[PDB]
Design a protein around this ligand. Structure first.
Ligand SMILES: [Mg+2]
Ligand SMILES: [Mg+2]
Lengths: 244, 111, 240, 231, 243, 195, 235, 241, 250
């Protein structure tokens, strides 16, 4: 019958790896680089759009950076359509928690459930895994500012600074060299932009090839603000850190 | 309004001696003030030296006996023709009866 | 629904998907359990290439299943979360119906049953995880340590190790663990657990996690400095 | 070859290889014989043991007071098919107060077997059955193959080396079909038939299995010391 | 290649090879025929006597559907039984909702659609039978033959199985000698004759003859098996005609 | 079963619950504890239909204990009360609803405050300085309306509780057999053995 | 690939034959039926010396009058044992009696072929089921993943089964006492085991009508091992 | 190469099973033609009964889908009858749900959608048939809509299907270049049937007897087929031209 | 029966490619050119009507479809796949938006629902991806005019102007030379007609070209009067004559 055409998406290789997870990770290694950096007073997410065109409408464009709620954002590396499926699931999950407990969802709890959904696709059902790696940036009143990543295996880990997509090996070396614990948000902004500048496969890093966002305590005391940067605001911060 | 029960009268009687037992019953079957039959047997040989009567609403009584007789047959099939002891029969009938706990067989049973 | 028999027999009588699940366990970071006279210590390796990691928030390798039992593992991290969640639910369910917390053997038997089930159900692959489950039964001071594997067999151990280079550290435990005289204290037990990992690890830094469990729901994870004190003591003692 | 992967595939010459492979398990099974007169129907079977410490596997299974069968091949598949028969015999008695005709039992087995030869995921049954019975039209003997084909016969045999017994019954037909009102002479004829399938091994007390059904004879099985009479 | 390993796959020339292989099972079977007459239909089949041990008259192949339809088939016998069971459900359901017994053209399409359904998926195999069937309804007599593809047409006469070529040639001569019509009684005799002629292509073992008929005048539009004297008379006519 | 009271003072929540269990014409038990510890700093008392009270309370206790293990963290009393209210609001439109009224007393260690929530069986939640379920509120609310102060100590809360229990013992038709009193504060939950 | 329910050209189910190969790799189990009871014994085979061998549980109670030993993929046995216990207890509930040993075995064997694309594969474990009932006395059965079960006077399964069965074929006779059977199980396990047999790497059990199913202490077995080396020394 | 066995894309973005289904369409070696008049729609198809044992009245590839809609099929009869039964069910259900007769173009779209699904879901094969639906629609007037195994459909002035379709197509093209209109300018369907037969004769280069054709006609509120006698009447009239 | 294809037919290859999506895009490459251009006061979408037979009536086959009163779509690739996406697109606009908020969805959210439908054909059991790329043009009160491209993978991008299909590489280059942020709708239409001529070798007129706009509200196309705040559809299909009138000024 149909058994003939089944690729068996959820089996081990003789070395004990999941082929489809490995191949999904190979797909992600060609996507635009996304970087996350955590400071004591905020978080930075910065991501490279994959070689754009001059006719693309950038201000209404969103391919890398998404809002999950008022306190949690994600940077995406992989198939955007796969990512949107997961993002909407995560948005609903956050709202269910708020409805149940009357408290905003703690960051790890949102991350765990999304990673469990990905894990499920590697173990049962015979469907292809999601070709997506996430960087989660968020705040809650237990751990403060937090960075996590998840990938198609549904494994997640926490970071002071991390990258996903293209050139993560080079990016991770550069982050390790310059990162320090007492670092502030404005220092992390410069670090993220400079790391992308050195690792990019493009001729030069310009405002039109970027998405940028911060999560800051910047407001009226003990309250957290998510700023997704408009194209002109990315252009300014590129001049202000001497990259263009 | 449909009432799924009736009453067919009749009286049954079981007595145990030292090395024997008897099960007796009248053969009249009735509804209200009418006689349906002057000879409608009510006590049955079910095999394995067991006799049974399920008295009251005769449709339920017949259904139960039928199910128990069938249970003796399958007891032989499933357990290499072992004889069904009277204590084992009694316990089996409890499950046949309690299985319809929320829509009972309207009978008083004696084996 | 997806129904395919992924775990099946091959001509030599082996189930390859279960054996390949074992290969995944071999690639996992090393884990070790040693039971003292009135304690159990679970030690875990953390990889050396993960700096810039935030240790405040990153998933710890030793998990409380209830207040008196812990679980560690080697293999796929994502797979282990599914086993830990089920174990946590079963432990609360056990307290709800029996009015008593699970024994360590009961909890182990539950997890291993779940592991076995996934080796002969349609449409699923086995777990790429082996576990060490340690703790104390309610109102009992005898320490317990069990091991489970992808196939679903489980058993009790005086001391055991799983994951990469476990052959080496099992070798060490087999010639340093005396059954007639188990580690008599918490200090002694931890030291033997750290000694065994220094055979395989690299640095006594954030590369070693240690969780101690004592009778009557007394479980605590050691800090870097406390663990580092043990490493310093062991280096100096090996100068002859 | 390229066409024997499953039951749902014809070969280029119109064969069903999984069904033919199921027929092969019947050929490896121990021999069993059936034959009938106008008053009685008889089964005889050679039972097989694992070694000298083991029991001899039972070949004969009762389906009702008036019907039963013997098997050759996968014994668990006989258990499944005889159970279905038992329920069908039982349904007929409970609902219609009617003893299931042997011919009807044959049709019901055929249709049940056939469903597993035309759908993906299934496999054919790996057992052959000889059904005997006595109903409103007298004695009957049926042969069932897991291809679905059921045949009514005076006598037959299935299992390894059954061609000897089959040849013998074909030569003896005119004589045994007339053994009426003499159950013992009909059985002796069946034991003669099965002896033509023996090579090296011979009939012993825990080797031989015999069953009979007839005019005033409920389906009954004889094993052990109850068959000594015929050795 | 590999276009023939799985049902419902089109080959590069638009064929379904699994259905063509199912036809091989049909061609391997015994000969069956149907003859249409003035007010009815006649069916006949060759039954190979494998061994003397087969009880004569007791392995009936021709099957009835409802009270007015006869069916016969060649190929895998169990597939035929499966198809007739489905036909009986279709006839009962029609009768239940519409009161009138199912007309023959209506019945033909019910079987046709069900046989065609088994050429649509790889999870089933095609039927390994060709079925000849018909009967009498409110519009008179109808005779049909249905292939493993699900294809069916109406017929003046029909044949299938191993001796189909001889039978077809023989049926065509019948239609020529008797152009204004054939009675139900000559049709019974002619069916015996044709099965006997068709049995030369299977001369190995000898055989048993089975005949059935539905006729307005002769059976009141009900399906009946030809038995006893009328069958013996048909056997004689056949014997006399071959020599 | 019958009476449950709660009062939040300066630094603690005091819960008092009657001890009688009464079936028909017989008092079956005079030492029943109508409470479950949900977490180290959260206590739930309950009253309502028989069987359902304890079944509901233990089901809640199991879920909060499951949460605590999974996150290695104690949910705030506000979060527990919202979870409990949702279960009751879910239940009121079930085939057979839980007929249970509860008081939840907790000390919020993050805010350093005691908190008292009253939730009826429909899922009607309110945060109050003092609360009660059933007929007990008809006698005790006016006492508490008079005497209660927000800066009261634990000892003052217990004396105010004595007035309430005395009024109930005087005017209530039923013999509820005294109360078990429990205090929830920063150090956890403890039982006042002499009341 | 191919279907899980495929017949080979010789008329055998591939998966069932392959599961029999996994059973050949199992540790040895021996059973011996006498008129005074049935003895069940097994090789424990701890894979490392730090494994606490009394946690190796290859002999199992099904009911007071029925015990069972296993060999092969022993994790597969747990759901079979669970079914057996439920079948024995359920029978007692429906019938106020003990269930026959053969009916219990048949119930376990009905699970065997319920695999396909039901469970995904056959069981990779064989059982020896020993017990007593009033109609047929003391009984030993060999339950296989083919769904077939044979009654035996004596039977060995697992890796040492070829050599052990040859030995049982000589030693078994209808008048064996229970004590003689115990010694005989120890002797034959001693022969086929790789390591030297002691009270920690082998285990005994039995079922008698009077006392039901018992797993022997290590001290009770230790005494029986000493008794056996003394028997062999005397000629 | 198992991309050739089910409806998934080949490396060149083709669906081979759909293409092979288009080839099954010609297996019967019948040619059909449809044209529109002022007040009617006519379809003609060749009829071939090679076997003398067949009842020729049951040999047909024209179907009465509803009282207003007719359908001619090019392809094997089993797939044709499958399509016909479904279309009958769809047309009747539409009338029940929406209270008016299902239009010809709307049925065509519906049947094309089912066919699209067979090109996208693996478990279903395409039907190896082309379906030409005709009617006189109460809104659109005379209508011809044709559906194929790719799930494609469109309306036609006139159309032709079968192995010798191109011969007929170019013949029809050359006629509408002369006339410069969308239809056959004629009152009676009889003369439109005569036009259709005339132009099939001239394009195929063959003569037809009354048993060589089958004819369907759609007029306002009914579609019907012609008997062999009605066709003979039509053939006679052509001969006198 | 039963659909027993409960497994994915699109899977990752060792290089990380999803083969079926790549092949679907190849089907789109071979399709007839379509394009869209955004102006200050409207949007235009256009494509060639590549008629299959001269006997076919090409106005019975629309490549440009109204999805909502202010949203339209065009495609390149497989037509039948497009036709069923339009059915589902029209329906999801009602079930997941209009029946909830009592108003039509904004362009980006309808595009998002179509995208989801297309993503699912790439992961769900027993299906292949859709062999089309869509251009979806629309207007809504709070976002103004917009133009989106949706691909077989489910990805979608906002464009100032773009082309898809056969001659898309040259057409995109042609559009980059001509586009600016001050274009009025009539200029955008004129550029749309110029761009499309480059890819049409045959006849080029109001009967071979299909063109639609999102522009001003058309109160004449509303069907009723009385409710002053209902002002009519912004979607409008240009007639054959309207296109011919603009080809003389070309
Ligand atoms: Mg309230
Ligand atoms: Mg398909």
């Amino acid at each position: 019958g149909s058994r003939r055409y089944d690729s068996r998406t959820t089996i081990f290789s003789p070395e004990g790896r999941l082929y489809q997870v490995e191949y999904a990770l190979e797909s992600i290694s060609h996507a635009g680089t996304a970087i996350g950096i955590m400071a004591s007073d905020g978080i930075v997410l910065a991501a490279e759009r994959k070689v754009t065109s001059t006719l693309l409408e950038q201000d209404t464009s969103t391919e890398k950076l998404y809002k999950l709620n008022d306190k949690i954002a994600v940077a995406v590396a992989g198939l955007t359509a796969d990512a949107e499926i997961l993002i909407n699931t995560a948005r609903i999950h956050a709202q269910n928690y708020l409805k149940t407990y009357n408290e905003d969802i703690p960051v790890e709890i949102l991350v765990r459930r999304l990673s469990d959904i990905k894990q499920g696709y590697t173990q049962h059902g015979g469907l292809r895994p999601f070709g997506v790696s996430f960087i989660y940036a968020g705040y809650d009143d237990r751990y403060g500012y937090q960075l996590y990543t998840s990938n198609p295996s549904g494994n997640y880990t926490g970071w002071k600074a991390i990258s996903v997509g293209a050139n993560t090996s080079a990016a991770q070396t550069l982050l390790q060299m310059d990162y320090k614990d007492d670092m502030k948000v404005d220092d992390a902004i410069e670090l993220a932009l400079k790391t992308l500048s050195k690792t990019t496969d493009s001729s030069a890093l310009t405002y039109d090839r970027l998405e940028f966002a911060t999560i800051r305590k910047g407001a009226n005391d003990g309250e957290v603000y998510q700023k997704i940067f408009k194209p002109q605001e990315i252009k300014d911060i590129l001049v202000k850190t001497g990259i263009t | 309004q449909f009432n799924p029960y009736g009453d067919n009268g009749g009286t049954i009687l079981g007595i145990a001696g030292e090395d024997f037992a008897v099960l007796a019953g009248d053969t009249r079957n009735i509804t209200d003030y009418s006689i349906n039959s002057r000879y409608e047997p009510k006590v049955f040989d079910c095999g394995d030296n067991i006799v049974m009567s399920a008295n009251g609403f005769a449709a339920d009584g017949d259904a139960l006996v039928k199910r128990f007789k069938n249970s003796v047959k399958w007891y032989h099939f499933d357990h290499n023709d072992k004889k069904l002891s009277i204590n084992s029969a009694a316990r089996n009938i409890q499950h046949l009866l309690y299985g319809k706990r929320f829509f009972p067989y309207y009978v008083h049973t004696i084996i | 629904g997806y129904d395919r028999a992924l775990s099946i027999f091959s001509p030599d009588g082996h189930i390859f998907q279960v054996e390949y699940a074992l290969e995944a366990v071999k690639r996992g970071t090393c884990a070790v359990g040693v039971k003292g006279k009135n304690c159990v210590v679970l030690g875990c390796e953390r990889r050396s290439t993960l700096k810039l990691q935030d240790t405040r928030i990153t998933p710890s390798k030793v998990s409380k299943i209830d207040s008196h039992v812990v679980l560690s593992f080697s293999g796929l991290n994502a797979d282990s979360r599914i086993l830990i969640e089920k174990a946590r639910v079963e432990a609360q369910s056990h307290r709800l119906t029996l009015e008593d917390p699970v024994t360590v053997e009961y909890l182990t038997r539950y997890v291993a049953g779940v592991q076995q089930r996934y080796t002969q159900s349609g449409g699923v692959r086995p777990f790429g995880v082996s576990t060490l489950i340690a703790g104390f039964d309610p109102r009992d001071d005898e320490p317990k340590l069990y091991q489970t594997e992808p196939s679903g067999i489980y058993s009790s151990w005086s001391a055991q190790t799983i994951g990469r280079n476990s052959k080496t550290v099992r070798e060490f435990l087999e010639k340093n663990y005396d059954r007639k005289e188990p580690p008599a204290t918490v200090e002694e037990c931890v030291k033997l657990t750290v000694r065994s990992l220094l055979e395989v690890v690299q640095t006594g830094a954030k590369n070693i996690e240690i969780t101690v469990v004592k009778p009557d729901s007394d479980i605590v994870a050691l800090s870097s400095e406390e663990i580092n004190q043990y490493v310093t003591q062991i280096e100096q003692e090996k100068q002859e | 070859n390229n066409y024997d992967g499953d039951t749902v595939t014809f070969s280029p010459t119109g064969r069903l290889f999984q069904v033919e492979y199921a027929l092969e398990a019947i050929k490896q099974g121990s021999v069993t014989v059936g034959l009938r007169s106008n008053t009685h129907a008889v089964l005889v079977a050679l039972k097989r043991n694992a070694d000298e410490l083991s029991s001899y596997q039972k070949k004969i299974i009762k389906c009702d007071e008036h019907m039963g069968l013997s098997l050759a091949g996968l014994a668990p598949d006989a258990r499944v098919l005889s159970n279905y028969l038992r329920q069908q015999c039982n349904y007929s008695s409970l609902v219609f107060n009617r003893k299931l005709a042997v011919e009807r039992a044959g049709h019901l087995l055929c249709d049940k077997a056939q469903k597993n030869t035309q759908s993906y995921g299934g496999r054919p049954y790996g057992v052959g059955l000889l059904i005997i019975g006595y109903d409103k039209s007298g004695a009957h003997l049926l042969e069932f193959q897991p291809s679905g084909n059921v045949t009514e016969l005076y006598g037959t045999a299935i299992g390894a080396r059954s061609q000897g017994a089959k040849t013998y019954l074909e030569r003896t037909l005119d004589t045994f079909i007339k053994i009426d009102g003499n159950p013992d002479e009909l059985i002796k004829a069946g034991v003669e038939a099965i002896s033509q399938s023996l090579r090296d091994e011979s009939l012993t007390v825990d080797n031989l299995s015999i069953a009979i059904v007839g005019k005033d004879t409920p389906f009954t099985i004889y094993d052990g010391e109850a068959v000594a009479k015929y050795i | 290649t590999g276009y023939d390993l799985s049902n419902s796959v089109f080959s590069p020339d638009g064929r379904n090879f699994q259905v063509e292989y199912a036809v091989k099972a049909v061609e391997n079977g015994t000969t069956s025929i149907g003859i249409k007459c003035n007010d009815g239909v006649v069916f006949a089949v060759e039954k190979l006597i494998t061994s003397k041990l087969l009880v004569p008259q007791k392995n009936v192949k021709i099957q009835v559907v409802d009270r007015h339809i006869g069916c016969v088939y060649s190929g895998l016998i169990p597939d035929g039984r499966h198809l007739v069971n489905r036909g009986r459900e279709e006839a009962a359901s029609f009768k239940k909702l519409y009161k009138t017994p199912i007309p023959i053209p209506a019945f033909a399409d019910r079987l046709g659609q069900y046989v065609q359904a088994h050429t649509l998926y790889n999870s089933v195999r095609p039927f390994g039978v060709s079925t000849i069937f018909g009967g009498v309804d409110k519009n008179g007599a109808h005779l049909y033959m249905l292939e493993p593809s699900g294809s069916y047409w109406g017929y003046k006469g029909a044949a299938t199985g191993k001796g189909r070529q001889s039978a077809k040639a023989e049926l065509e001569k019948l239609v020529d000698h008797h152009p204004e019509g054939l009675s139900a009684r000559e049709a019974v005799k002619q069916a015996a004759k044709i099965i006997y002629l068709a049995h030369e292509d299977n001369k190995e073992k000898d055989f048993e003859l089975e005949i059935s008929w539905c006729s307005l005048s002769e059976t009141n539009g009900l399906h009946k098996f030809v038995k006893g004297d009328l069958l013996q008379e048909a056997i004689d006519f056949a014997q006399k005609e071959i020599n | 079963m019958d009476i449950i009271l709660g009062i939040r003072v300066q630094d603690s929540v005091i819960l008092a619950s009657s001890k009688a269990v009464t079936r028909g014409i017989s008092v079956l038990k005079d030492s029943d504890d109508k409470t479950r510890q949900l977490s180290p700093h959260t206590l739930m008392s309950f009253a309502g239909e028989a069987g359902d009270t304890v079944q509901f309370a233990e089901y809640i206790q199991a879920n909060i204990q499951l949460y605590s293990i999974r996150e290695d963290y104690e949910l705030s009393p506000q979060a527990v009360s919202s979870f409990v209210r949702q279960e009751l609001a879910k239940s009121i439109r079930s085939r057979r609803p839980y007929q249970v009224n509860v008081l939840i007393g907790g000390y919020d260690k993050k805010k350093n405050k005691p908190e008292l929530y009253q939730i009826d069986y429909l899922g009607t939640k309110v945060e109050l300085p003092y609360g009660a379920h059933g007929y007990s509120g008809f006698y005790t609310f006016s006492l508490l309306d008079h005497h209660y102060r927000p800066d009261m100590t634990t000892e003052e809360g217990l004396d105010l509780l004595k007035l309430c229990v005395q009024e109930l013992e005087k005017r209530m038709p039923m013999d509820f057999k005294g109360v078990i009193v429990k205090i929830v504060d920063k150090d956890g939950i403890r039982q006042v053995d002499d009341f | 690939d191919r279907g899980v329910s495929t017949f080979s050209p010789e008329g055998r189910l591939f998966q069932v034959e392959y599961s029999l190969e996994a059973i050949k790799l199992g540790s040895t189990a021996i059973g011996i039926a006498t008129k005074e009871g049935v003895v069940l014994g097994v090789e424990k085979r701890a894979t490392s010396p730090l494994l606490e061998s009394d946690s190796i549980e290859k002999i199992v109670e099904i009911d007071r009058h029925i015990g069972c030993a296993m060999s092969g993929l022993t994790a597969d046995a747990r759901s079979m044992i669970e079914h057996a216990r439920t079948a024995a207890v359920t029978h007692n509930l429906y019938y106020d009696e003990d269930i026959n040993v053969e009916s219990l075995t048949q119930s376990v064997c009905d699970l065997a072929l319920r695999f396909g694309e039901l469970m995904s594969r056959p069981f990779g474990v064989a059982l020896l089921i020993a017990g007593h009932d009033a109609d047929d006395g003391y009984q030993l059965f060999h339950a296989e993943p083919s769904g077939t079960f044979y009654r035996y006077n004596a039977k060995a399964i697992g890796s040492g089964s070829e050599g052990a069965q040859a030995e049982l074929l000589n030693e078994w006779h209808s008048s064996l006492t229970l004590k003689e059977a115990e010694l005989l199980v120890l002797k034959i396990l001693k022969q086929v085991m790789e390591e030297k047999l002691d009270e920690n790497n082998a285990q005994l059990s039995c079922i008698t009508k009077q006392d039901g199913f018992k797993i022997y202490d290590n001290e009770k077995t230790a005494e029986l091992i000493k008794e056996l080396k003394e028997k062999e020394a005397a000629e | 190469g198992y991309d050739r066995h089910i409806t998934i894309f080949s490396p060149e973005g083709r669906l081979y099973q759909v293409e092979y289904a288009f080839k099954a369409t010609n297996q019967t070696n019948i040619n059909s033609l449809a044209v529109r008049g002022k007040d009617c729609t006519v379809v003609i198809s060749q009829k071939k009964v090679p076997d003398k044992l067949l009842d020729p009245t049951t040999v047909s590839y024209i179907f009465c889908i509803s009282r207003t809609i007719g359908m001619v099929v090019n392809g094997p009869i089993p797939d044709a009858r499958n399509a016909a039964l479904r279309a009958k069910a769809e047309a009747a259900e539409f009338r029940y749900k929406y209270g008016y007769d299902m239009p010809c173009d709307v049925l065509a779209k519906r049947m094309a959608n089912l066919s699209q699904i067979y090109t996208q879901r693996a478990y279903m094969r395409p039907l190896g048939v082309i379906l030409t639906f005709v009617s006189v629609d109460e809104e659109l007037g005379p209508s011809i809509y044709k559906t194929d195994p790719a799930g494609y459909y469109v309306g036609y002035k006139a159309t032709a299907t079968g192995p010798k379709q191109q011969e007929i197509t170019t013949n029809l093209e050359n006629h509408f270049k002369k006339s410069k209109i969308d239809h056959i300018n004629e009152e009676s369907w009889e003369k439109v049937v005569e036009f259709a037969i005339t132009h099939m004769i001239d394009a195929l280069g063959t003569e037809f007897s009354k048993n060589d054709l089958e004819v369907g006609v759609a007029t306002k509120d009914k579609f019907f087929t012609l008997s062999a006698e009605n066709i003979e009447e039509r053939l006679v009239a052509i001969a006198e031209q | 029966m039963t659909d027993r294809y409960s497994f994915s037919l699109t899977t990752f290859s060792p290089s990380g490619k999803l083969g079926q999506i790549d092949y679907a895009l190849t089907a789109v490459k071979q399709g007839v050119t379509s394009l869209g251009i955004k102006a200050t006061n409207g949007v235009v979408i256009a494509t060639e009507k590549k008629s299959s037979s001269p006997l076919a009536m090409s106005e019975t086959l629309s490549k440009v479809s109204l999805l909502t009163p202010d949203i339209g779509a065009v495609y390149s690739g497989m037509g039948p796949d497009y036709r069923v996406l339009v059915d589902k697109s029209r329906k999801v606009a009602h079930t997941s938006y209009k029946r909830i908020y009592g108003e039509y969805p904004p362009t980006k959210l309808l595009v998002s629902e179509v995208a989801k439908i297309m993503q699912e054909a790439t992961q769900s059991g027993g299906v292949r991806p859709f062999g089309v790329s869509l251009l979806i043009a629309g207007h809504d009160e709070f976002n103004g005019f917009s133009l989106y491209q949706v691909d077989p993978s489910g990805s979608y991008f906002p464009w100032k102007a773009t082309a898809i299909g056969k001659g898309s590489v040259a057409a995109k280059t042609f559009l980059e030379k001509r586009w600016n942020d001050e274009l009025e709708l009539e200029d955008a239409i004129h550029i749309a007609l110029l761009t499309l001529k480059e890819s049409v070798e045959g006849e080029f007129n109001g009967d071979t070209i299909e063109l639609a706009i999102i522009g001003d509200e058309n109160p004449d196309l509303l069907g009723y009067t009385g409710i002053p705040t209902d002002k009519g559809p912004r979607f409008r299909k240009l007639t054959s004559q309207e296109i011919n009138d603009r080809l003389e000024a070309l």
